[PDB]
């Protein structure tokens with residue numbers, strides 16, 4: 001299938017990314033507390049449900065939450081401020097809490113079931129979010145005796161995610177804190193604005209995009 005792109009809500013950020021985040025790819029967004037990476041996740045979970053003319057892919061969402069950062073009320077707010085129906089938008093986000101790193105890996109494996117079910121329907125899964133990719137791995141695998149296993153497990157997890165992205169034409173979006181992935185780094189700008197910097201993209205030039213966080217999620 002042709003690569004599809006989901007608008008981030010920000011024209012500036014979309015331009016930096018070559019149109020939006022890609023299906024058949026993992027986009028990995030880094031940032032510190034309050035960077036906007038989870039706000040971007042919430043915005044994408046709304047945007048993807050729109051038609052292509054509006055920046056979406058007529059899709060469903062699956063969301064794996066590792067430390068309780070998913071906010072249904074924020075989804076409703078973004079949906080309503082974008083002229084959408086908040087209840088319908090929420091219904092098409094399948095949610096799973098991951099309690100630990102093993103569970104998180106299992107959830108990605110098992111997500112394939114719902115992906116298969118929705119595949120040839122009116123609302124195929126088009127966005128799979130893991131927020132965050134590494135919090136459990138960082139917490140569980142401490143020090144050097146644990147580094148080898150941590151990297152091996154994380155690598156396997158990313159491979160599973162890549163497979164779902166490629167096989168089922170899904171945009172995978174993961175958050176992290178400091179190929180395989182397209183890496184975007186968020187930081188605080190001036191006056192409450194946020195700045196995204198794209199780094200080490202094989203076929204997109206590095207660059208920066210300034211964006212805002214609003215009742216619509218993110219936008220220029």
Ligand SMILES: c1ccc2[nH]ncc2c1
Pocket residue numbers: 062063064094095096107108110111112114
């Ligand atoms: C949401 C995200 C991942 C999942 N795996 N299984 C069910 C499910 C729901």
